[PDB]
Amino acid sequence: DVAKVMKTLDGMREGLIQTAVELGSIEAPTGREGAAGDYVYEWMARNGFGPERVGVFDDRFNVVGRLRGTGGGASLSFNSHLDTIMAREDTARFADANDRIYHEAWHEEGRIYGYSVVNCKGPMACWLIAAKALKEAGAALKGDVVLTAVCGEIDCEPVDEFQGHDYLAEDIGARYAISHGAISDYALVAEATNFKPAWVEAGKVFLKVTVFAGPSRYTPYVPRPVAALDSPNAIVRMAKLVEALEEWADNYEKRYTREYGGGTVVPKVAIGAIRGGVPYKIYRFPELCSIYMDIRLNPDTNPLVVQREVEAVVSKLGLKAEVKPFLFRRGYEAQGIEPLQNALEVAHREVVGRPTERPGSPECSMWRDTNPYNELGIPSLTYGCGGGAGGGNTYFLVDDMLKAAKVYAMTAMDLCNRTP
């Protein structure tokens, strides 16, 4: 059997490339995944996987289709996300928000370019094709292959005045798809891990640290000189509080690094946004300033602890501030992973040619939709070609992508013919 499908995949290498660029080209930042979901739905429908739209909103939804099997076998789920990181105009976060790379995809040489291809249509293209190969090669499976393409993978979260349809992400994402029928015995999340599989990922907690100062004064009445920490301008105290937290951040990852079977979790910290006062009324400095911090958690850290830690960092400076968490998610290590791990491993050795190695710490220290599967008792690990977009890599090698498709196919052939 295995050789039948392999020759078939070489049959669809161009289709592999076409599918990636066509998919990569669609503008699908988180919040607008709709166009891409529609693309995949039709693609899936065209090929007889009989897709369904699972979503909270009619323009942001997941697509679930499946390659039915003869019966009485384990079922395997393949997962990838529709959204991409950068919107067309994200001038707030990127110095050159117009680079061709951020918003398009193209075949310039044996490699495919585009942040939207690395994250994450390249992998999605891989297993979408793999499913095509199996069906088209009439391979024998006793169990279903479930094709789950989801939205809201990326860590966009509603906060403050940003609520609702536009800002929601993972709440309506894969966990929605699963809780509403996209269930399997096992699940493989396809993302760029560099052909190294990992079955652990990290939690996260988001804190909005707001520091109070005052009282407001019209600029001509502002009192100087004053020590930074004693400033009335809340932006000034925040400047000091940012440097304290940066030193706390350097230590946090070292203290909380944890080694797991699935990987070694190095949980990092970052200050993603700041804002105090408004740009269109600056004549009065603001009595309060806020920062929004992204703190990763190993599966065993309690978000309540980390808050008290940061509350502490504030108290040590004698600052008065409000530390409030506005996002909490848990990270998981896979349990009962062996059947997929092995099924994956055999395919990998055959195609890649050597044993699999431990993944890089970042790839085990992020959010991947394996956490939702594991949360709900579906053992899941992540494996795909190339290097992580967060790195960030900007291209895929058509050869590696073809390999990854071979591995996915072979994994399915192995795993789907085992009885649970």
Ligand X SMILES: Nc1ccc([N+](=O)[O-])cc1C(=O)O
Query: In the range 78-107, which residues lie near a second copy by CB under 8 A?
Result: none
| DSSP sequence for 265-326 | E---EEEEEEEES-TT--SB--SEEEEEEEEEE-TT--HHHHHHHHHHHHHTTT--EEEEEE
Q: How far is the CB of 352 from a second copy (least distance, A)?
A: 24
Looking at the DSSP assignment, which residues form a beta bridge with residue 223? none
20 binds a second copy (CB under 8 A): no
218 binds ligand X (CB under 6 A): yes
Look up residue 106 and give its DSSP letter.
Answer: E
Per-residue burial over 319-357, b if 16 or more Cβ lie within 10 Å, else e, is bebebebebbbbbbbbeebebbbebbbebbeebbeeebe
Residue number with CB closer to a second copy (183 or 346): 183
Site size for a second copy, by CB under 8 A? 82
119 binds ligand X (CB under 6 A): yes
Q: How far is the CB of 37 from ligand X (least distance, A)?
A: 18
Measured CA to CA, the distance from residue 350 to residue 341 in angstroms comes to 14
312 binds a second copy (CB under 8 A): no
Residue number with CB closer to ligand X (208 or 217): 217
Q: How far is the CB of 148 from a second copy (least distance, A)?
A: 14
Residues between 311 and 340 that touch ligand X (CB under 6 A): none
Residue number with CB closer to ligand X (191 or 345): 191
346 binds a second copy (CB under 8 A): no
Among all chains, which residue has been given the structure tokens 């609520």? 163
Residue 245: what residue type? L
First to last CA, the chain: 22
75 binds a second copy (CB under 8 A): yes
Measured CA to CA, the distance from residue 69 to residue 49 in angstroms comes to 12
Binding marks (x or -) toward ligand X, 360..399, rule CB under 6 A? ------xxx-------------------xxx-x-------
> Taking a C-beta distance cutoff of 8 angstroms, is the pair 186, 77 a contact?
yes
Residue number with CB closer to ligand X (1 or 294): 294
- Which of 3, 108, 280, 283: binder of ligand X (CB under 6 A)? 283
- Which of 140, 228, 230, 349: binder of a second copy (CB under 8 A)? 228
Residue number with CB closer to ligand X (190 or 319): 190
Answer yes or no: 153 catalytic. yes
Answer yes or no: 83 catalytic. yes
Question: If you compute the radius of gyration of the chain from its CA atoms, what whole number of angstroms results?
Answer: 23
Residues 6 or more apart whose Cβ sits within 8 Å of residue 414? 343, 346, 347
> Taking a C-beta distance cutoff of 8 angstroms, is the pair 331, 306 a contact?
no
55 binds a second copy (CB under 8 A): no
Residues between 61 and 100 that touch ligand X (CB under 6 A): 85
Which of helix, strand or coil describes residue 243?
A: helix
Measured CA to CA, the distance from residue 62 to residue 321 in angstroms comes to 40
255 binds a second copy (CB under 8 A): no
Which of these is catalytic: 33, 52, 153, 185? 153
230 binds a second copy (CB under 8 A): no
Contact partner, 191, from a second copy, ligand X, none, Cβ < 5-8 Å per class: ligand X
**Chain center to CA of 143:** 28
Residue number with CB closer to ligand X (156 or 321): 156
Contact partner, 85, from a second copy, ligand X, none, Cβ < 5-8 Å per class: ligand X
**Span of 86-94, 129-137, 178-186, 402-410 interacting with a second copy by CB under 8 A:** 178-186
Measured CA to CA, the distance from residue 297 to residue 202 in angstroms comes to 5
Q: What amino acid positions are annotated as catalytic residues?
A: 83, 153
